[PDB]
A paper describes a structure:
Oxidation of sulfane sulfur can also be carried out by persulfide dioxygenase (PDO) from the superfamily of metallo-β-lactamase enzymes. Thus, it was shown that B. leptomitoformis uses PDO to oxidize endogenous sulfur.
In the B. leptomitoformis PDO structure, 14 residues from the C-terminus are not visible, which indicates the mobility of this region. In the active site of PDO from B. leptomitoformis, the residues of the first coordination sphere of the iron ion (His57, His113, Asp134, and three water molecules) are identical to those of other type I PDO structures. The second coordination sphere of the iron ion in the PDO of B. leptomitoformis differs from other known type I PDO structures by a single residue (His117), with His replaced by Cys in hETHE1 and BpPRF or Ser in MxPDOI. The His117 side group, unlike cysteine and serine in the corresponding position, displaces water molecules located in the internal cavity of the enzyme, which can stabilize the hydrogen bonding network near the active center and affect the enzyme activity.
Residue numbers in the entry:
A (entry chain B), B (entry chain A): 1 to 235
Write the structure that this text describes.
């Protein structure tokens, strides 16, 4: 399977390109507006046709490239069904794969950063690849102080959906602010400072309430724009 | 491919189990004497026959489990041909793969931690997996203060053989002391404090000469025992 991990420096977002060599089709996971041209150039170099874009959640920190990408390529936009967004073409749910050629992408419902957040995993035959979005991050996790942030729920999602995955599962996060690209489930259970040493839910909730971070400066218009699949506002 | 990453806490070594699901045969990379029982129980639980043990180098910090494993399974011991060790069955060299069923293991000569150090890589179809031994480590690299320690040579080895692999290449290290399990070539180029920022060779050597770390406890008898494939001394 073709695989590329792409970084967007303004928002520190990872976009994941997955491609099927047999059918020459591809899906972009969490594409960013700022790097629409870069993603199209890479797809053209590899001779892949963009068949789906795929969001893990409704981002507050950047605008989704999905609207632009669908204009320029005619791909279908896929994102969580529970959001009931008219502009989306495909509604993702746990239990129903998204098939890009011979690649199967399995959603996992992981709320708590947002209420409709999904992670995705792919079996390569040797590794499970976990695109964990903002649910589990490398040595951290998604912030829970947004409106629909729910730390107790995020803890459940990580414990039940992600830490029940085998030790060698690769963790590909939605963001990183420190130059890290990859982890594994065993590594996060061993040393993630927010979840290691069988930290209890109560201790996790207190830890996550004790974080004080400036909100993403885009938050005002990114969330409504991303509810429109990345379509800019008139303002 | 069956893949497991196994930790041995006393020396902080990673042993890697690779298995062919079709022929039911396996290899262990850097098996440790203290965990021979564990490795054999795991092999049996997976219904695998151990065909080869494979060392990255002559270890100074632990005794290889290769000798005992061969006694107990009848496997063959493979290690770098340049060491010319009579107890070994197979001489490893760059350019000649080690074949375990349908799994192909490719050596890369990467001296500088020792003069015979080899890394190994495997292609899963989606990832290149780099077993880097003590050449490249996560956010560090192997110590260069042993007798055949050669910092300038290690730098060449990492730059020419490892940093030229593709970005998404997985880095499975020989050791880790901070609970990390995995990295990528892109991550290490990006943020490894010893090698990032196009750090110069002279700067890398100055840094390595400034590190002061204690010698591994077992070093006096581990190196001579591993030249006998992990057979203990009488005394
Ligand atoms: Fe987010
Ligand atoms: Fe070593």
């Amino acid at each position: 399977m073709i695989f590329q991990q792409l970084f967007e420096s303004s928002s520190s977002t990872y976009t994941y390109l997955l491609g099927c060599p047999i059918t020459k089709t591809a899906v972009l996971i969490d594409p960013v507006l700022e790097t629409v041209e870069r993603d199209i150039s890479i797809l053209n170099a590899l001779g892949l046709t963009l068949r789906y874009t795929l969001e893990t959640h409704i981002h507050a920190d950047h605008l989704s490239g999905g609207y632009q990408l669908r204009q320029r390529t005619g791909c279908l936009i896929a994102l969580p069904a529970i959001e009931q967004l008219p502009c989306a073409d495909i509604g993702i749910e746990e239990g129903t794969p998204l098939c890009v050629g011979e690649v199967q992408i399995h959603p996992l419902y992981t709320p708590g950063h947002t209420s409709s957040h999904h992670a995705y995993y792919v079996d390569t035959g040797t590794h499970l690849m976990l695109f964990s979005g903002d649910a589990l991050l490398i040595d951290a996790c998604g912030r829970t102080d947004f409106q629909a942030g729910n730390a107790g729920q995020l803890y459940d999602s990580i414990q039940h959906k992600l830490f029940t995955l085998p030790n060698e599962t690769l963790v590909y996060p939605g963001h990183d602010y420190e130059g890290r690209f990859i982890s594994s489930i065993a590594q996060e259970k061993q040393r993630n400072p927010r979840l290691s040493n069988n930290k209890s839910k109560q201790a996790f909730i207190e830890l996550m309430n004790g974080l004080k971070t400036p909100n993403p400066r885009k938050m005002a218009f990114a969330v409504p724009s991303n509810k429109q699949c990345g379509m800019c506002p008139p303002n």
